[model samples]
Target: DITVYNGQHKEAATAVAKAFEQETGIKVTLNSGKSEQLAGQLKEEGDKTPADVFYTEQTATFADLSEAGLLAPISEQTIQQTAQKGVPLAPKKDWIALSGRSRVVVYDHTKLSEKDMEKSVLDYATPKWKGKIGYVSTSGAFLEQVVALSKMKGDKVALNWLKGLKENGKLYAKNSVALQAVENGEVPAALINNYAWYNLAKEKGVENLKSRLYFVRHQDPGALVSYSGAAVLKASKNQAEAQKFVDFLASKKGQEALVAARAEYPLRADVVSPFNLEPYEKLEAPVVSATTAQDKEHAIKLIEEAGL
Candidate 1:
């Protein structure tokens, strides 16, 4: 038996766990919680942690554990199995990406043409977008976006950008709510994960949905492509079993299962996305390293300091 701390959505986690058990007969005791909570629990317990594996939807949590020296290094074979061409999906060799999502601006098609969308994500901070954009202030993805901005530019530039956003932006509780607000014409556009719109479109019928997604290319923070990751804990008693689980997650079977469960893009080349998403290779996301992306606490601190 292996203990798994799962921070991905419950449905996707359950599907992966069930499939793993059926295929390997290694009983999985899956525990679910928010990424921050679970990462904190693992840190508090340290070498005494009951979890053999940590799986999360957000990259920062994996980075947190890895920074704390809580993660064991994964094998090269496993890393290769999970690797997505052109995208640096893994934060460290210790943690591997299982699935991926990209940051995008979702706009109301009726109100704005393709040319009306901002050329860069940073443009939302300018007067031209004042009171015209919406965002979920507290989402991990959004905080990561701020973190990427801080790394790509500088703290001064990032903080000023956040201040501008605060002065001009509309706040929503969740990405879905922000996307819905755009769809209903409550706002013209919103910054959100690409998959959020895909999930919403699936639920509400594409023909009825008024919002369209825009990917800001040229390696901009607006085009930050983040991934859900898995790692084996350093304290695991079942290291081999734990590695197997992580490997399975990166395998074609595992990637396919994740796509079926959550509509996320798969990290492996063999796996194709169920939805017709833009080719991953074509997204010119900013070159933020895994080590930088994993700086979650710093990111959160900067985001809070910005009063975001």
Candidate 2:
């Protein structure tokens, strides 16, 4: 038996966990929550933690453990699996990416002309968008995006950017609601991961949605892509079992399962997205490094300090 701390969506990670159980006969105690909260739990519990493996939908979530030397590496075979797929590895090699998620603007084309969409992400935070843009700061990639902005634009710019967003932005409780806000004409646009828009299109016919997703093309924060991954805890008692679990997640079999259960793009090269998304190569994703993102707390602090 293994206790798995799952921060990815319940449906997706549970699909993988149940499949692993059926194949390996290793009963999994899957506990799901926000990754940062679970990481804090692991820290407070020390070696007494019940979690054997930890998985998050944001690589930034694994930051605390990866940087603190609390995570154990899985097999080299698992590490190389992502390499073959062109997926990235966690900075310290303590975790490996399982899927790719990108940030995009969902705008009401009826309200704003396609050509009027901001060419840069930084433009959205300006006073020009006040009450016109909805922000879901509570979402996963917001923090991930925040770190990327801090990395590429410098801390001052990142801080001021968030402050400007808070000043100009309207609050949406969840990403889905933010999507609806635009569709209903409550707001002209919103920022969210691509999956939320996919979900909306799945529920309501794509033809019916008044809004459309704009894949910001330049190497700007608007086109930033983020990652999600799995890591084994160093203090886990079931080292071999834990490694196998992570390896399975990084394999083609598990990636396929995740694609069915989740909307995020499969990082592996062999898997194609079910959603007809913009070609990955065509989008000029900012090549920001995750080196300084290991302090997710700092990102949250920035969010709070900026009053997001």
Candidate 3:
């Protein structure tokens, strides 16, 4: 039996766990929670933790585990299974990316056509865009985007843009709320992960969905791509089983499972994105490693100071 601390979406986590069990005949005891909550529990429990594998939605928490030496090294065989496919498979030797999410502008077509959409995320802070946008203020994805922006554009510019966004934009508790606002014509656009729109659009029916997605190309900070991460715990007695679970997540079968279940981009080349998203290579996303993007304590502090 192996224990899994799952921070991925509930349905996807359950699907991955069930499939892994059926294939390998290893019993999985799954614990579900938000990534930050589980990461804190891991720190509190340390070597006494019951979890063998830690599966999460963002790199920052994985970086925390790696920094604290709580992660076991992922085998080279497992790393090579998906590394050259252009995904940041392993940010540290201890952890690997299982899936991806890109920051995108979800816009209302009636309000802003493809041509009217801003080419860069930074352009949204202008006077014309004030009161016309919405975003989730407390989203982990949004925070990571801010961290990446700080790295690419420097603190001065990133903070200024964030401040401008705060001044102009409406705040929501979730990305779905922001996207729904766009569809309802409450706001012209929203900064969100691409999957949020895809999932919601599918539910509302593509024809009835008024919100259209706009990718900010040209390696802009707005075009930042982040991953959903996985790792084996250093304290696990079932290290082999744990490694198997992580490897499965990075495998073609696992990546395909995530794409089918979550509508996320697969980390492996063998699996294609299920959404009608812009091709990942053509996205022109800025070069930001998971670990580098995770190390931005100052970015969070700056965002809070700006009252985001």
Candidate 4:
């Protein structure tokens, strides 16, 4: 039996756990929470935590563990299971990505056409969109994007972007609320993870919704590709079993199981999501390492410094 600190979406995480259990006869005990809280608790417990695997929605949680030296190296064989052969998807030996989501502009169709939107994500911070842009400062996805931006454009540039967003953007509590702001015309656009739009459309119907997705291509941070991360804890007594679970996640069956419940892109190149989304292969996101995007601490400080 292995215990899992699941920060990924409940249905998606549970699906993988269930599939792993059924196939391998390995019992899995899961505890779900916000990725930040789960990481904090794992860090607080250090070598004594009961969590065997720290599975999260973004690289930042894995980053927290890696920075604390709390993660164990994953097997090389498992690394080969990723969409990119022999690539770990995240920090080498520390974690691997199971699934992915890209950041995109969710805009009110009435307010702007696709051609008029900013080509790069950083442009939104400028005075051109004053009080017209919206985002969730406390969102994990948002923080991960900031971390990616900091890594790609450097901290000073990222800080200026955050400051610009603070001055020009309306702050929302959640991505859904931010999306609603766009729908109601309270704001013209909101930056959010791609899944949020698909999930909303799943319930309300895309044709009925007023918000439209504007994918920021051209290898822009706005088109940053973040992922659902999986890693084994160094403190676990069940390292081998944990590694097996991580391996199971990257396996073909695992990716299918996860994608069954998530509106996210399965990490396997052959796996396709049922959602009406831009093809994952066609989306040209900037290339930033998952480990580099793990510097959430400094990114958080930059966010605070920018008062966003």
TM-score of each: 0.89, 0.84, 0.89, 0.83
Question: Candidate 1 lDDT (Cα, whole model)?
Answer: 0.83
Clashes of 3: 0
Q: Which residues of candidate 3, in runs, are more than 4 Å off?
A: 84-86, 89-92, 289-297
What CA root-mean-square deviation does each model show from the true structure? 2.7, 3.1, 2.5, 3.2
lDDT for 87 in candidate 2 is 50
Worst lDDT run of 10 residues, candidate 4, spans 83-92
Q: For residues 189-283, what per-residue lDDT tens digits would candidate 2 score against the true structure?
A: 99888889987787777898899988887788778877778989989999889988898887788887888777777766676666655545556
TM-score of 1: 0.89
Per-residue CA lDDT of candidate 3, range 1-308, in tens?
89999888887888888888888898888898988899989988899999999998876677777888899999888877666445664446898877678888999987789898887898887677888878776887788877877778888887888898888988878998898899888898989888888887667777888888889878888888877778899999899899889888877777777777887766565677666555566677677766443355777888987878
In model 2, the worst 10-residue window by lDDT is 82-91
Expressed as tens digits, the lDDT of each residue in 1-308 for candidate 4 is 99999887889888899999999999999999988789999999999999999998876567667888999998877766665532235445789877778888999887788977988889998899998899899987788788878878898889999999988989999998898899998999999888888988988998999899998888888877776778999999999899999999988888888877888877677777777665566777677765443476788889889977
Between candidates 1 and 2, the lDDT winner: 1
lDDT by residue for model 1 (139-255), tens: 878887887888898888888778888888998999989998998889999998888898887777888988998888888888888778888999999999999999889887877
Q: Which is superior by TM-score, 1 or 4?
A: 1
